[PDB]
Amino acid sequence: AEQFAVGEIITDMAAAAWKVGLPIGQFGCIYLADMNSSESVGSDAPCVVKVEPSDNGPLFTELKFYQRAAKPEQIQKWIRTRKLKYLGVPKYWGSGLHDKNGKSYRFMIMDRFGSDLQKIYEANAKRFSRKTVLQLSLRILDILEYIHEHEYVHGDIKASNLLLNYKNPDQVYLVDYGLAYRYCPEGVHKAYAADPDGTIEFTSIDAHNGVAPSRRGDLEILGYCMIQWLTGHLPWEDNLKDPKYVRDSKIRYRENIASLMDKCFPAANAPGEIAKYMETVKLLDYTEKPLYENLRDILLQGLKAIGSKDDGKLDL
Numbered sequence: 001a002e003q004f005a006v007g008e009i010i011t012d013m014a015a016a017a018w019k020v021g022l023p024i025g026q027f028g029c030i031y032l033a034d035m036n037s038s039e040s041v042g043s044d045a046p047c048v049v050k051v052e053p054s055d056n057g058p059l060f061t062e063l064k065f066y067q068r069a070a071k072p073e074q075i076q077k078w079i080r081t082r083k084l085k086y087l088g089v090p091k092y093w094g095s096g097l098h099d100k101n102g103k104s105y106r107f108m109i110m111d112r113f114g115s116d117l118q119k120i121y122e123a124n125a126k127r128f129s130r131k132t133v134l135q136l137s138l139r140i141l142d143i144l145e146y147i148h149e150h151e152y153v154h155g156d157i158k159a160s161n162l163l164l165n166y167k168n169p170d171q172v173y174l175v176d177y178g179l180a181y182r183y184c185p186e187g188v189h190k191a192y193a194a195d196p197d198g199t200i201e202f203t204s205i206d207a208h209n210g211v212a213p214s215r216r217g218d219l220e221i222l223g224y225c226m227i228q229w230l231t232g233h234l235p236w237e238d239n240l241k242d243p244k245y246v247r248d249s250k251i252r253y254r255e256n257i258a259s260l261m262d263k264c265f266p267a268a269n270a271p272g273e274i275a276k277y278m279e280t281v282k283l284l285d286y287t288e289k290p291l292y293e294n295l296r297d298i299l300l301q302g303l304k305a306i307g308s309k310d311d312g313k314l315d316l
């Protein structure tokens with residue numbers, strides 16, 4: 001059911017005008033978009049428009065995240081004060097309401113990106129280098145600190161939700177906030193309890209226990225991503241139709257991190273920073289603020305160990 005006539009001009013709530021183009025990648029109802037002009041929206045368009053029915057829960061949740069935490073100035077303010085090269089939270093350009101065929105739709109204008117990391121990962125035979133993984137993880141730590149300090153957790157960090165800057169292949173961005181969770185509304189942390197799951201292979205022990213995600217869970221998810229990226233595998237990958245198996249493995253390997261290193265890496269040739277990252281996350285209570293700079297330090301020690309430095313090069 002077509003939501004737009006191709007090339008039509010749509011006006012957002014702040015009266016900014018946009019033109020709609022073709023769908024991206026033959027990834028659901030997302031289309032190329034540009035500023036209104038006399039030219040057609042081209043295949044090098046710098047924005048996308050996401051469109052779902054107005055009763056779509058996830059789009060409303062995602063829009064609320066973008067309006068509260070991803071305003072171009074809010075981001076740029078943070079980049080200067082923390083002294084970052086960039087921050088991989090996608091920019092929000094506007095949103096509005098669009099009727100078609102007597103149905104109401106919601107739309108949101110975002111940055112357009114290049115390729116997702118999962119596509120690149122599979123093309124490199126399901127491996128990322130130790131250099132790539134550390135540089136990705138440093139930048140993801142910057143993103144998680146930001147969203148966490150703005151009252152949200154992601155709950156679903158993975159290669160397919162990591163997109164490259166369209167014009168810069170060394171900058172990575174975390175997308176999909178449709179099931180993001182505001183863990184700390186008005187600074188009051190949610191209780192250790194359910195709310196009225198993420199991706200099974202990567203999700204947190206907390207999520208497996210049926211409680212709402214928190215900050216430690218995000219860090220833990222990143223942890224499993226690093227092992228998947230480094231080795232091409234996780235121990236529980238043949239049992240993903242059985243959540244209790246996956247939880248059991250995760251609980252046992254959290255309690256004995258050395259056995260996880262033994263299982264996932266050969267020999268006694270496990271990258272030490274990974275074990276250290278996991279131990280640090282293990283110390284966090286459900287409500288506790290992570291010490292993000294100590295986690296970045298642990299990763300930076302890994303870069304030093306391979307004769308490199310945080311030069312921002314993702315090396316893909």
Ligand SMILES: C#CCN1C(=O)[C@@H](C)N(CC)c2nc(Nc3cc(F)c(O)c(F)c3)ncc21
Nearest residue numbers: 024025027048090110111112113114116175176
């Ligand atoms: C064209 C092209 C490349 N391209 C793809 O192939 C795939 C991987 N996707 C879908 C994820 C893309 N998505 C975006 N923008 C975007 C989408 C969001 F859902 C979102 O929340 C957001 F902030 C930005 N630009 C380009 C691509």
